[PDB]
């Protein structure tokens, strides 16, 4: 039996699926710990490794990248879970090692790969406390080249009156995604600030794990792929739409929650966003 994870339904993804909008022919790059290409519920189209000691992008030694990819594109079948954009062309851009960490050089090389490889959507379920001129340049070029760039806002919670939004999420060109639970409440870990764009489900997210497994994870890292998945859904309907048009539609059609410093524009609604 297939299970539809809460977060899929919450964002109104099945409404587009019923209409035949499933993200077919949209290339989504999961810039992460790799993807387990061996998982029965995933179809990996390609990718590349930027981790010097872990040369195979289709070996997830972490679990992180397989779980992110399952949220985006877990196949519509009789098994496992259901992704947001189940027909999307999934790319494993391995930038993180087995420990879940990576060098800036590795991540930036991964972004650079994604631009050269004509990726429609980048998902970056990662962040750091500090930026770089090279990090900003790679995200900026990706947006200038027509790529939809989506990132996790961070898991830093509240800190006085300051923004706790990490990089690359902090950059204007990037969609920064915060976490809500099933009730539409902001998760206590969810990074806050003026740079917060949108909210998506990020608490106890059921997805694919390596070795034909399924399990839940929590974080803004879980919320991000819901937005990257939603961007793929829009593009399958409106193939002609710019990255700018995709972004404005996602932010302009949200279910409004609390204050923008905590919730940004609110919860994404792909059904309203797809027009």
Q: Which of 81, 124, 195, 200 binds K ion (CB under 5 A)?
A: 195
Q: Which of 176, 198, 209, 232 binds Ca ion (CB under 5 A)?
A: 176
Are the CB atoms for 227 and 175 separated by under 8 Å?
yes
- Phi, then psi, of 219 in degrees rounded to 5: 155, 165
Q: How far is the CB of 14 from K ion (least distance, A)?
A: 28
Shortest distance (Å) from residue 196 CB to K ion: 8
Kindly tell me which residue out of 44, 74, 174, 267 binds K ion, with binding defined by CB under 5 A.
Answer: 174
- The Cα–Cα gap between 263 and 191 comes to 9
- CB 99, CB 62: distance < 8 Å: yes
Question: Which span (20-28, 45-53, 170-178, 203-211) binds Ca ion, by CB under 5 A?
Answer: 170-178
CA distances from 248 to 162, 202, 253, 254 (A): 26, 22, 8, 10
Establish if 32 lies at the interface with Ca ion (CB under 5 A): no
By CB under 5 A, the residues from 86 to 115 that bind K ion are none
Q: How far is the CB of 233 from K ion (least distance, A)?
A: 21
Q: What is the 3-state secondary structure (H, E, C) of 10-30?
A: HCCHHHHHCCCCCCCCCEEEE
Q: How far is the CB of 107 from K ion (least distance, A)?
A: 16
143 near K ion, rule: CB under 5 A: no
Give the H/E segment covering residue 135: helix 133-144
Q: Between 174 and 268, name the residue whose CB sits nearer to K ion.
A: 174
Region near K ion per CB under 5 A, out of 68-76, 176-184, 236-244, 253-261:
176-184
Q: Which is nearer to K ion, 88 or 174 (CB)?
A: 174
CB-based burial label for 133 (10 Å; 0-12, 13-18, 19+): exposed
């Amino acid at each position: 039996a297939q299970s539809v994870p809460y977060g899929v339904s919450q964002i109104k993804a099945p409404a587009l699926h019923s209409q035949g909008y499933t993200g077919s022919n949209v290339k989504v790059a999961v810039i992460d710990s790799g993807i387990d290409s061996s998982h029965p519920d995933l179809k990996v189209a390609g990718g590349a490794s930027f981790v010097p000691s872990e040369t195979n992008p289709f070996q997830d030694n972490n679990s992180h990248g397989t779980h992110v990819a399952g949220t985006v594109a877990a196949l519509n079948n009789s098994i496992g879970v259901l992704g947001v954009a189940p027909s999307a062309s999934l790319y494993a851009v391995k930038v993180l090692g087995a420990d879940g960490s990576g060098q800036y050089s590795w991540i930036i090389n991964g972004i650079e790969w994604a631009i050269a490889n004509n990726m429609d959507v980048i998902n970056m379920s990662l962040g750091g406390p500090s930026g770089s001129a090279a990090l900003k340049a790679a995200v900026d070029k990706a947006v200038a080249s027509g790529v939809v760039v989506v990132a996790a806002a961070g898991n830093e919670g509240t800190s006085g009156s300051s923004s706790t939004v990490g990089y690359p999420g902090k950059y204007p060109s990037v969609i920064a995604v915060g976490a809500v639970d099933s009730s539409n409440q902001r998760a206590s870990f969810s990074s806050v600030g003026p740079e917060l764009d949108v909210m998506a489900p990020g608490v106890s997210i059921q997805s694919t794990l390596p070795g034909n497994k399924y399990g839940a994870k929590s974080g803004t890292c879980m919320a991000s792929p819901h937005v990257a998945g939603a961007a793929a859904l829009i593009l399958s309907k409106h193939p002609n739409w710019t990255n700018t048009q995709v972004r404005s539609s996602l932010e302009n059609t949200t279910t409004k929650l609390g204050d923008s410093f905590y919730y940004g524009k609110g919860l994404i609604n792909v059904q309203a966003a797809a027009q």
